[PDB]
Design an enzyme around this catalytic site. Structure first.
Site, PDB file in Angstrom:
ATOM      1  N   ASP A 281     119.379  63.343  54.457  1.00  0.00           N
ATOM      2  CA  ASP A 281     119.595  62.961  53.060  1.00  0.00           C
ATOM      3  C   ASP A 281     118.936  61.616  52.742  1.00  0.00           C
ATOM      4  O   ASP A 281     118.281  61.457  51.717  1.00  0.00           O
ATOM      5  CB  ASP A 281     121.082  62.961  52.682  1.00  0.00           C
TER       6      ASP A 281
ATOM      7  N   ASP B 217     111.703  73.047  55.506  1.00  0.00           N
ATOM      8  CA  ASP B 217     111.411  73.732  54.268  1.00  0.00           C
ATOM      9  C   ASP B 217     111.535  72.763  53.098  1.00  0.00           C
ATOM     10  O   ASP B 217     110.605  72.631  52.297  1.00  0.00           O
ATOM     11  CB  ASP B 217     112.358  74.922  54.086  1.00  0.00           C
TER      12      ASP B 217
END
Ligand SMILES: Nc1ncnc2c1ncn2[C@@H]1O[C@H](COP(=O)(O)O)[C@@H](O)[C@H]1OP(=O)(O)O
Ligand SMILES: Nc1ncnc2c1ncn2[C@@H]1O[C@H](COP(=O)(O)O)[C@@H](O)[C@H]1OP(=O)(O)O
Ligand SMILES: O=C(O)CCC(=O)C(=O)O
Ligand SMILES: O=C(O)CCC(=O)C(=O)O
Ligand SMILES: [Ca+2]
Ligand SMILES: [Ca+2]
Lengths: 415, 415
Positions: A282, A306
């Site tokens: 994050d 991804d």
């Protein structure tokens, strides 16, 4: 009954002790791709043939061989043939291949054909380099500070498609096992509940990280960052980080920097210190915007890779020109990374940049670096020239609008 | 033996049929927070008292009551007391609370105290609004186009911490069950393999999406976007999207827009059409950079929400001033969203903006909108004035450098 035609002129690439042996007339299977594949693939074929021809003055030539997967495969081999067995055999046999975007159908319980190809051929590295092309309209102030190479683990993670539908007999069975046999207490709502499985292995992690480090060494890169959500998923994401650091210590002489946890690995060719570090996923999505220059080679799990690859591509204005490879020990499959965009299919309108740059990676993978360099050079020139497809042009002033095929030519013109 | 002191003056907030009853002298539990909590919490207390005092001319006053969690809790209640039972009871009893950043220890098998608090109190909504403050240094060209509100599901997902370590007897047992009883074939490396479980339920999804839609209605927002990775995880992420759309149809009169799949929901108060749509998570991380203005309220699962909130905060220069709430049916816990940054702890240096804006959300949650408005106003003024903490100042020219506490004052000065 195969509908594939082996080119009469042409020789198969061979693999001899982890080393590709590429003849001057290699056969390269290609999958046209669905939707805009009809537009970008021919642009790619032409641009590649030009670079190869210019680099080696006719001494080398690729023999393109069409193979099939996706919507077009059903038109060729019939109704339920989305991914023919022979396609898998052919890619493995010929070692190097490229493809346009694929259509995975909805409503038939078919899973991602892209993922199928990757898993089935064990192409465990998803390789996504991200750099800025001067002249590309970007939404960020300093896209030029982004120069990264993502090694995304391709064979494990929640991405592997192990899951059961809510209310299915299997779901119920798995949840029963977990609650009653494993003593799982933390499923908030055990009824009407879907369940997915996220695996992460030592071997899976290490082959991915080994490749990332070898790549940093081979290309004299500054660092490898393990990106992971290990503080929440300790035994998958956290284990990936730990295995990564461990691999660095065990195989590459990684040693503590100050108090750690970062390591230094000495480049055995240049003596450069390669930093091995880690960032929570994050925070990393923040750091790529705020401090992109601190990052180089990235190693991470399937799903995170991804996200990261896509986030990076958008930031450098490269959503439509992001190259990608899927690489295993026995073969490699390069790909357009965007979707099939059916709305524009056949209009010779979209940006062929992504598949063209994946072809650049393919040429480089083959040791044809001179031809690869000519594509990079062409792409840089055409973009700098503001001679571009609609997706760039609509974001710029004073650009000249080119069709897909015309942008292909502009690349060649700038070689 | 409690070390909590109930304020002599002060009355507890009550909940009467989903409606908070807030007295003029409410008791608000607060957790100071570890590391820089010592700096930001007192700035928050002062700024909140000022706004409340100015808004209601002394008629209202918060009675702050310190409670404990994290490193400070061990200093207060002893050795292994990271999260005392009473803290859970107190937050539930007093309905509204706020906290600084928390330190979760490493090496002791303790999981995220933040997550513990959320799960234990069933605070199933993680609410993260993201907007731009004029004057904030941002890495993107048009941060002002970002005005979103993230509803992140807080009680399920892989984030729930269900997993077993590679080579553990349990891991082996789970993998055996999966391969032999469930016929799972897609685990690439079954040995030395960690395993995590990702649950997603109809009830869990719908309470989260119900809240997101009610919020769009209550605040006259333009749309709710379901963000998910459903094309790969069909039965968790995909089910979340499907349940979301279904909830919209079943409870809010959602109806097809054109050929779908988007829906329109009529705002029963303003008659505005609220669009319910969906975007795959990887594309969404691109779209927030390239087309931020098309997005408003976001509803998504736990892990994705984590990523999205952080990505958005970075893009608007708000990494250190991102407010956040954790909201359940019985109580609510507002929080600083950054980490404990121990290196600066006690230096009165860091940005108190995050916890201050979470306090703004708290005041608004309490119906004290006038005081909340004064904080927004103060924050806007201080930032516009370029009177800021180091983290902003180092990125700007001609700013005046303020200490943490001084930035608190600047906010008050601009009320
Ligand atoms: N190579 C490309 N050049 C230009 N635009 C592209 C390209 N690839 C994808 N796009 C855009 O992204 C989408 C990808 O298609 P899909 O995700 O549905 O498979 C298209 O609808 C198009 O969006 P747009 O309507 O903005 O022009
Ligand atoms: N409120 C804040 N104001 C300024 N900087 C912050 C704030 N919160 C976090 N930071 C920065 O982010 C990090 C968060 O701490 P941690 O993630 O280790 O818990 C800190 O090291 C500091 O980084 P920096 O060294 O760049 O100034
Ligand atoms: O491949 C797919 O079909 C979806 C996931 C994806 O875009 C990717 O893996 O690159
Ligand atoms: O809460 C944690 O400790 C890690 C995850 C996180 O930052 C969050 O959930 O907001
Ligand atoms: Ca993708
Ligand atoms: Ca976070």
């Amino acid at each position: 009954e195969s509908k594939v035609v082996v080119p009469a002129q042409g020789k198969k690439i061979t693999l001899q002790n982890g080393k590709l042996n590429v003849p001057e007339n290699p056969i390269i299977p290609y999958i046209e791709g669905d939707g805009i594949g009809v537009d970008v693939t021919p642009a790619m074929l032409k641009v590649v043939d030009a670079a190869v021809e210019k680099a080696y003055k006719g001494e080398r030539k690729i023999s393109w061989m069409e193979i099939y997967t996706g919507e077009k495969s059903t038109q060729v081999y019939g109704q339920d043939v989305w991914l023919p067995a022979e396609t898998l055999d052919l890619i493995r046999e010929y070692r190097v291949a490229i493809m346009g975007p694929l259509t995975t159908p909805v409503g038939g319980g078919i899973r991602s054909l892209n993922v199928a190809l990757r898993q089935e051929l064990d192409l465990y590295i998803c390789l996504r380099p991200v750099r800025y092309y001067q002249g590309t309209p970007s939404p960020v102030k300093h896209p030029e500070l982004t120069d990264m190479v993502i090694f995304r683990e391709n064979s494990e993670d929640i991405y592997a498609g192990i899951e059961w539908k809510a209310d299915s007999a299997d779901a119920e069975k798995v949840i029963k096992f977990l609650r009653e046999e494993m003593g799982v207490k933390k499923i908030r709502f055990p009824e009407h509940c879907g369940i997915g499985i996220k695996p992460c292995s030592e071997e899976g992690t290490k082959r991915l990280v080994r490749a990332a480090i070898e790549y940093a060494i081979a290309n004299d890169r500054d660092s490898v960052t393990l990106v992971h959500k290990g503080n929440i998923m300790k035994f998958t994401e956290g284990a990936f980080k730990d295995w990564g650091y461990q691999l660095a210590r065990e195989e590459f002489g990684g040693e503590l920097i100050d108090g750690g946890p970062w390591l230094k690995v000495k480049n055995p060719n240049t003596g450069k210190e390669i930093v091995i570090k880690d960032v929570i996923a994050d925070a990393f999505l923040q750091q790529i915007l705020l401090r992109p220059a601190e990052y180089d080679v990235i190693a991470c799990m399937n799903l995170n890779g991804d996200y990261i690859s896509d986030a990076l591509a958008a930031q450098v204005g490269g959503i439509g020109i992001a190259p990608g490879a899927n690489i295993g020990d026995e073969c490699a499959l390069f790909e357009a990374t965007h979707g099939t965009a059916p709305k524009y299919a056949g209009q010779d309108k979209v940006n062929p940049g992504s598949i063209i740059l994946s072809a650049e990676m393919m040429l480089r993978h083959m040791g044809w670096t001179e031809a690869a360099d000519l594509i990079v050079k062409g792409m840089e020139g055409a973009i700098n020239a503001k001679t571009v497809t609609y997706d760039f042009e609509r974001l710029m002033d004073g650009a000249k609008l080119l069709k897909c095929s015309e942008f292909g030519d502009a690349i060649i013109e700038n070689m």
